[PDB]
């Protein structure tokens, strides 16, 4: 297809057998080699076999391909010799995003996230790659964290901001944390948060659905308990960062996301009873 | 101090000022204490400084910090030079990251996780890093590489860390990619931590040599080798796991191992006296 710049693909015949059997393109095989990262041929096979080729193609390959597309399109803007000044910097960021995506890959392959999440997660980087075009136009923007972020990204950090910024903690301490950790860690946080919020909201709907009173309110206890704990972690981590206690934003996102998921299922299961 | 004149910020809390006056701390010294204070409260740094005595405070806290701030001031002059408008911002941002890291050492010190020797040892790691701006402005492309920000000492340390990490399986390019992903802020901190462990291990080495050859020398010797092993293994593991997509932080658990070596040194010395 369009993604000619790749030229790195599966060589393992067993995987090749499941990819041909699944009926995906040369384009397809390439994309899988990309997100394969340094995970073995065999383990990529092991995950994929358990799932239907049907589910696989739309949930995994399609989304990956959308990304590789927009990355090809961004790569061009680096290659352009008008952008030689900003070239190396852009390539570096490209490598960071690459690692992050391959990580979402890793996470899906070893079973930590489902197909749905994988699809949802990988698309997060599409606007980030697309952002290169805009940045080149007036380069001074790169020395800021926000210079690298689309409006969905800014929206998400502005949400986290409203969670942490308060009387005692202002826009300045917050922005300072983000400038310290860098885009790499910032976007990772963004994604992790998005996950947590999505699953929290599904648990919300599911709980509303439960017949009024009896155990319904007991569920909303857990919902509120979990939300409080998570929001607390966000504040705790940012305060701790500004205070000098630690040098890393850690929200315990994955743990809380799983908590909301279990909760959603108990709410769906209690609607029925 | 004319070198600290760019600062414009110093202790306000009057009881703290009284204690610093009781100690002989200059104006500049006040300005330094205010600097490493960060967001800690005057009560906290008062509590710490009080139990220590003017001799130690002046020599291990104030003198090193003040030297550091003089350096940071030079670096600031390079930043604000109008020639360097084009890169001004990017340097200030690094300047801020470095502030944070220093205030962190401040923090560990005030809350008792490190003592005076470590504070003075660790805080001067940053002087080269600020000085480096002077060179960086002359050839701005260097900023696009993490090694562009490292001074000679930093380079040395990284090379050494590389030798611990690089394999037939894991090569110089992979190693360099994690450095670049993580950025200078995390890279320099891993360097300080590593240096602490390395320095403590050597102290523990000497202390074991001092033990009369014999009964418990071996048992201590085992610990030294085992500990070095465990640490070096943590380093390799964290880099591999990083390029493998397993995790997104370089973490060597270095503080834990610094303490292990310090305890080991103390045990070694108590053993010299007993035997």
Residue numbers in the entry:
A (entry chain B): 163 to 435
B (entry chain A): 162 to 436
Excerpt from the publication:
A total of 548 amino acid residues and 13 sulfate ions have ordered electron density  forming  a dimer. The first 91 amino acids of BTA121 and N-terminal putative PARP domain are disordered for each monomer. The monomer can also be viewed as having four helical domains (D1, 164–214; D2, 215–299; D3, 300–344; and D4, 345–435). Domains D1 and D2 are in the N-terminal bundle while D3 and D4 are in the C-terminal bundle. The interactions at the dimer 1 interface are hydrophobic and have a palindromic sequence. The channels and tunnels connect all the cavities containing sulfate ions. The presence of such an extensive network of tunnels and cavities suggests that BTA121 may bind small molecular weight ligands, including lipids.
While BTA121 does not share appreciable sequence similarity to any known protein domains or motifs, its N-terminal region is enriched in proline, glycine, and glutamic acid and contains a potential procyclic acidic repetitive protein (PARP) domain that was previously reported as having roles in Trypanosoma brucei survival and successful replication in its insect vector, the tsetse fly. BTA121 is a completely helical protein separated into an N-terminal and a C-terminal helical bundle.
